[PDB]
From a paper:
A HEPN (higher eukaryote and prokaryote nucleotide binding) nuclease Las1 and a polynucleotide kinase Grc3 assemble into a tetramerase responsible for rRNA maturation. Las1 and Grc3 are highly conserved proteins and have recently been identified as core enzymes involved in processing and removing ITS2 spacer, which is a key step in the synthesis of 60S ribosomal subunit. Recent studies have demonstrated that Las1 is an endoribonuclease that contains a HEPN (higher eukaryote and prokaryote nucleotide binding) domain responsible for rRNA processing. Grc3 is a polynucleotide kinase responsible not only for Las1 nuclease activation, but also for nonspecific phosphorylation of the 5′-OH of the 26S pre-rRNA produced by Las1 cleavage, providing a signal for further processing by Rat1-Rai1 exonuclease.
To elucidate how Las1 and Grc3 cooperate to direct ITS2 cleavage and phosphorylation, we determined the cryo-EM and crystal structures of full-length ScLas1-Grc3 complex at 3.07 Å and 3.69 Å resolution, respectively. Since the crystal structures have similar quality and resolve more structural information than the cryo-EM structures, the subsequent presentations and descriptions are based more on the crystal structures. The ScLas1-Grc3 tetramer structure shows that two Grc3 GCT are stabilized by two HEPN domains of Las1. Each Grc3 GCT binds to a groove in each Las1 HEPN domain and extends to the ribonuclease active center, which is formed by the two HEPN domains via dimerization. Both the crystal and cryo-EM structures show that the conserved catalytic residues Arg129, His130, His134 with two copies from two HEPN domains form a symmetric catalytic active pocket. Specifically, the side chain of Trp617 within Grc3 GCT inserts into the active pocket and forms packing and hydrogen bond with catalytic residue His134. Moreover, Trp617 and His615 in Grc3 form extensive hydrogen bond with residues Arg136, Leu99, Gly98, and His54 within Las1. Our crystal and cryo-EM structures exhibit that the Las1 LCT is located in a groove in the CTD domain of Grc3. The side chains of Trp488, Trp494, and Phe499 of Las1 LCT are inserted into the three hydrophobic core regions of Grc3 CTD and form stable hydrophobic interactions with multiple hydrophobic residues of Grc3. Notably, compared with CjGrc3-bound CjLas1, ScGrc3-bound ScLas1 has a more compact catalytic pocket, which may explain why ScLas1 shows better ITS2 cleavage activity than CjLas1 in the presence of Grc3.
Numbering used by the authors:
A (entry chain C): 2 to 167, 180 to 237, 248 to 434, 484 to 502
B (entry chain D): 2 to 167, 180 to 237, 248 to 434, 485 to 502
C (entry chain B): 65 to 139, 165 to 301, 303 to 618
D (entry chain A): 65 to 139, 165 to 618
The structure:
Amino acid sequence: IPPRIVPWRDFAELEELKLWFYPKSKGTIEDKRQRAVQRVQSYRLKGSQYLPHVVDSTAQITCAVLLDEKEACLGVHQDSIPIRLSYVMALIRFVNGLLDPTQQSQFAIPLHTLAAKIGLPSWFVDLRHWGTHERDLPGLEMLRWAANEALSWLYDHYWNDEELEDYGYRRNDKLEKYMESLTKTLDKWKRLRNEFLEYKWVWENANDSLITSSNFSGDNLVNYSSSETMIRENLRQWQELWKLSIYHNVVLEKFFNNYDPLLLKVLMLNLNNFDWKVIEWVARNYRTQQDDSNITTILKRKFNAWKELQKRLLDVIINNLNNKNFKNKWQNWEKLIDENASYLILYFCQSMLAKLETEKITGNSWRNKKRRKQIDSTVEIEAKLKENIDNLSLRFNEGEIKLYDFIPAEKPVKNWSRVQNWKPKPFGVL
Amino acid sequence: IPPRIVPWRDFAELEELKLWFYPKSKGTIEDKRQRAVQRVQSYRLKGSQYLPHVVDSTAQITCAVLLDEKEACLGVHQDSIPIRLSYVMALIRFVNGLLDPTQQSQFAIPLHTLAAKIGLPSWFVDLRHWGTHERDLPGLEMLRWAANEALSWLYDHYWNDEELEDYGYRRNDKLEKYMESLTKTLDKWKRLRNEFLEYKWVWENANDSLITSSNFSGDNLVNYSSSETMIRENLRQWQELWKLSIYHNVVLEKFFNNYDPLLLKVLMLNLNNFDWKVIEWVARNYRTQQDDSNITTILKRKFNAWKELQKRLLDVIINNLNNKNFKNKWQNWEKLIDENASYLILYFCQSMLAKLETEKITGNSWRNKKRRKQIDSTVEIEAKLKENIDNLSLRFNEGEIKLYDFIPAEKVKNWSRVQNWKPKPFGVL
Amino acid sequence: LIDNITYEGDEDETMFVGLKEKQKLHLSGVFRLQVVKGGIVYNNVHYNASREILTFWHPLSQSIPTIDFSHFAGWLRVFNSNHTGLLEAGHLYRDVNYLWKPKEPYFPLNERTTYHLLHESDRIQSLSVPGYWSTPLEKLYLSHKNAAYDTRIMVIGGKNSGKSTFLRLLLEKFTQDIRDSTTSQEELVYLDLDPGQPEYSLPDSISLNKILSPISLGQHLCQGSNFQTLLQFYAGSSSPQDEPTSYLNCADKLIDHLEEQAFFGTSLLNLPGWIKGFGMQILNHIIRKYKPTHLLFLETANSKRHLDELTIPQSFSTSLRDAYAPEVVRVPAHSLNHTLSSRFHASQLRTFKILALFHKITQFDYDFAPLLKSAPLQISYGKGKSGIKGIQFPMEFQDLNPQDIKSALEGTVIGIYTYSGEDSLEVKSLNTFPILQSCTSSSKNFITLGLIHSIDTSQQIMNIYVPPCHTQILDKQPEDAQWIIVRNKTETPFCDFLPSPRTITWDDNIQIPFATFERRKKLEHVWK
Amino acid sequence: LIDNITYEGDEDETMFVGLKEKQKLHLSGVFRLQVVKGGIVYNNVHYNASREILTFWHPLSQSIPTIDFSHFAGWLRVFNSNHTGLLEAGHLYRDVNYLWKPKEPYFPLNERTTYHLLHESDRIQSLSVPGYWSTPLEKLYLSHKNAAYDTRIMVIGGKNSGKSTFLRLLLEKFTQDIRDSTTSQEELVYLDLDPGQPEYSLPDSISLNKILSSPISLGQHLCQGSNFQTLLQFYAGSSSPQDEPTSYLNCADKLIDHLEEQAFFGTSLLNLPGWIKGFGMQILNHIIRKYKPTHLLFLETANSKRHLDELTIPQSFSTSLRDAYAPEVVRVPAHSLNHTLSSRFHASQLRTFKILALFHKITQFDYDFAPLLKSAPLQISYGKGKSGIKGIQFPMEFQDLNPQDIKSALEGTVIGIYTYSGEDSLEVKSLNTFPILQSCTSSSKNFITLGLIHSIDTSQQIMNIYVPPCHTQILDKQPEDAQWIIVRNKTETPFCDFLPSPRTITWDDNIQIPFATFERRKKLEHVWK
């Protein structure tokens, strides 16, 4: 049973619809089908496809029976020919509608036989070309009788009858065959932790290094590292595991369950777009703790105090971020900053702003003459940050850091703005 | 080319209709489209056996088009599910009619091939399902395009194109053989006139001879005609010729050309419903001379003058008619009496009043007792003739006889019977 | 078989037949028999003759049931039909020229005879009552005398059922038996509730009619004159379907009448067949209503499939308070066995009965002169009104232009009606026409069909033909009583409507309206 | 008949193959080549080996043509396209999983490789280039340089005729010339007015868009190529023009006029919706006289072509322009691909992927396929003023919608953001806090991007919704003043985004889902189809 789309929000809504369509007891002032068809007219709007045939026809018909019910001056042109015309159309549809779908086939039961199977009286199927083929349209009474009869049938078989007859495994398998290769690669990482440190050079500068000596070296130059390649392959399995932006939030859920301070340095350097996914997840995890007392996040399990978090994780990322890498992706960050607002972000931005200045004092390189074009970017970034920093410092004081420790652990609107803090909802209620 | 019934009265009814369907004027007084469908919604009262399809769906479509174009918080705009339905319905009925008549064109054709001959737009065949076999009815706009094109297409194809493509000897044949026999019989009678004049007892007492000696008489008698048999055989052909009431007027015309008062007497005695069939035809031919002054009637030609008419025929008939018989058929005479009125019927009722006032004179026979249920019907009858004499004598006078004589000779009361009728074919009042 | 002697005259060309042993005689068309001796066994039935005549009817479309020789003891006859002109009508209509007689029989035929011998060579069907059909019906005249109550019998089938044959079989037998029983007040009533193949009823009309001597059989195409019509209703179409909702209502009014007279004895009706279709819907309220003590199904392998739900569903046990009874049987046949029309369309036939009435002077006499020649009695519609009170229309045509109305009425069959129980006239006035208002008019009397030749507006008079037979019933009524005319869709005859040379020559000068003689413009073909 | 040179090539799965060999090369997916030496024979076309990278788009649905070698003279080759995302869709979309790679290949699949190698054993069919087509398509080439006038080329086909590939073959052929002609500045503008299986335009939309000479991108990219820039566009809102004929012809008519106003001179290309049998001859017959086509084309052959004949000839005119004074007539074999067209890929299944690729498309070559419901939508407010949103446009039917239930319809419905060029007046009829454009009309409006509504807040009057990420900041770019219109038309929001696969997203078990039901459907509620 994979879910189906249906235009009504709820079953209760459907319950609401049925009662409108057939007023109980009396129809004198509560006919409530002028409104009933007004709604179904919307469901058609959300999609034609989604609406059931029976629902669609129960509105189409009740439309036409309502059309004839006009009895007042000023006298209308109507010749009672459109209305004679309308009643039939619903029926050719409404009756054609049951047989054809699901689906009319090269091998199919003859029409009379099919009508019997559903529960359709075979006096309908006579109907199907009954209007179209015959020279002249039937009289009003014959149609009137049929609608007030058919409608009861719709109520009789679908509205008032419950007969029910008419993903989990294969899509969980690919996810399974991901997590294992993940947990196989992390369990390959720990055994290498020592090796990565000895070889600081291999991970750190992979983007950095333009040229390789072996290619440069001449053939047969003179008579004359499987822990380097073993690192790069483990890293390759990290990039390859990272191409899939779908399970990103589960690579992390496993990473933070096995946090290594050293690892973060490795990941940020050699995994494109890894720097802004972590902090984004650190915020979603952080806020979530704030919103609900109950769900002690992986972050609160890893970290039981704000300070512990700041030195161990929050501070560490800032130190290792490439100034250029952060710049060259600022748009991602502003959204990151824009999307989610919380004190943590303020400390981040301020810390991010601070280091931007200390890379200016350090600025008096030989390469300074070159700098002028790129100066017009760093300032802008500094410029945006001040707007974002000053913003938050009006919403978030240091009074919130106390609302992270105090939780007991478990042992305007502007046009087209990103919505700052979001909890996923299925197209309902934000 | 056998005639076709058509619900409009004339081409000046169907020339006029064409203007209404396609006025070329958008609004108000000039447009006459509400009315135009309100008369093809009339022909439908007579219709629709007579009515062609090509004028039905051009009144079916245009009715739904006036439906969606309602601009005062009404019709199509406030809710538009029906309007979409109407557009499609009258369209399927449109294509199907030309499209599916089939019988007009040979069976088993694929529709497009069927489509090709008449000049149908090809897409129209594609048109037929439109809303029947597709989940959502087509766009309220897409319906609009077809309807306006369709009226245009029908008008170009049917209303103004001139193509006309898309015996009854037997009625002549049946009559001629019959005429040969009326003429064959009449001549035979002339030959038999002496035998008829002589054997008078045979055709006079037709009523009396319930019992015949020949039926009673014994067979192969030890002890032991042409004239009687011939008359009896000839008086059968008359009977057989008189059974076909359609040619009743044909015979009467033929008899008059050959008129003889013996044949008159003869026929008035042995053909049922003959005595009133003549006076009607006479009241007919006498009437049409008065009104129409240029046409010489067979009767006028036969009789130039009144008294000649009066003595020769009117006078002769009155004596002959059987009074006992006359009563039985009287509602006949009544309607005929009412049915046709003229000074000729004035003198008739006065005469046939007098003949029933000489029968009471000689009527004084022995048998008073057995007739006490036979006088009232004679009372009511005479009362009926007196009323009709007075109602006629206030309209008709001796002057008319001069009116008949001076002609040149060429050598609303509820349920009623209209007095004078000239065959009019469901028109002209 | 060598032919028995025939003696001409005195009148009627009566012909006497001797057949060796017991043999099947063949007759087509009218004739009246008075068999002195022996027992006649048509359809395995007994008819003793003791100076008592019996008129026969022998139409072509049906199979003609031959006449058997039964004992005892045998070995005027072949009497000509009483009616003067009914045969004569063939000229006005000439798809009916062979209803009574075949085109080339093995006989020099004659104008004088109203009957015709059909000796094998001709090939017309003679098929005798199938014994399969016999035990189902044999079981019914045994229920007649021992029922101890009037028995309601219902027969139902689709067209081609041969249903007409079944009820005819029952009627002649129930008819013979009633005569024998003394003293029987049980005059069976035939309740014709099918417009489509009307029997004993005006065409496209519903008639409840009593079936009283003298003896007539079997099929007369409604000219039989063996019935008296107590009351009748105008359906206005050749299908219940055009107005099913009204028709059951019209019928519903009719059946209740039987309790209005509170009648008791045998009764029979044929429902509109409706074997497959709305008929399943149609039947289940009158099975509910008629309290049918005997249903009858003939579909068999017809197929008999369509009528599955109804027999049990509408049974509601026994509707009648006293009868409290049920019955469920099937007999399967198609008859006549040869093709059902026998080259005779019901719609081609349906037109004959219309034409045949409009020329009926009296039951025994027919004149086939086109009605145009005859004077048509005149009715003046009243605003006030005198005579016509209002003109009544089917529901659909309730919005009509005033001008076109005169055109619509003329040359179209209409059914005459009387107000009966007093009511407000309740009619809107259009163009000097008192159109009926709101339709309705629930209580009314149907007297006769009417055809309109002309309408004169200024006069307010209305030139209308009626079949002179009922004249003077229209005349024999209070003048004051209000009259309503209902223009339902009953088809006017073409042969009559605009006549022919030979038929009539008219006048050269005159123009005939509603007729065009130009060959049709292409695409002008009617959808049929 | 032996594989060669599957070099590991570090990151990016870079690979090598040899020009010299006499067997045609095959491949499936998104790769990009620079030849070292030796010419290439793709679709009977020549590109030299001198160090210019050419991307190659090989979606599965279209037939895949081999790569041909030729002189002179040989014997980074084949390396991955720079897309993080595009290949990964399947996890989001089950149907499109095998689009770039066949399900069982008889080659060793590699997760890190964009491009797969296919050799006979695999099912996929290479039509390559029909010989019959070439004489017409070839001879069109002889008329580009020669004409000395802007050449307007139209192609009309029933869907499945093969028009989309005839155009790219023209498109590929023409582009090669533009790079090599000095100075040829006449970049062709594709004029894609077919929303049925649109190529080069936004879902259920219409576009006139320029085509860039370099760097090369071929052949079919499912509209994901970086090689075209949208100049102007319009949104029909329907699978076919027929649903809204009135606008499309008008919608198109405004398209061509733009061409005049910018006063282009040079090549132009168009494919109409084929509309072979139907209303199409009249509908086409309107813009044939407008587009002033130099070379109208036909492909049906034994199409059968019967329906698509008479209307055009009446439609055909002596000239569409003073200088032109001409018309051309041709008919062609219409069948490609030879194998059955769906190839497991009905158009109706592919179209919903294009809607998906946009919303999840982060950048020109980077796609993130996480279910949208994780991404946070941007928010603008429909309002009494309103300032962000003033009225929402509904097609003519649906006019009578009652106010209360207006909100429910909007949520979860794909919509097309429109910008109003300066307007005489706002034309708002409002029910229950939504301003609705009562009389429609509103011809002024402009098309920036589609959006899909996440939810709407009656009280705040704010309207949370998603927009494809690439489009920001273009929404950001438009001045604050400019009016915003939300147009509702029948486009299909993909199911896959609407309720994410349970594994894909974790929701609190309790939370109600507004628009779905998991009860088995009682007989018999089914979508008629």
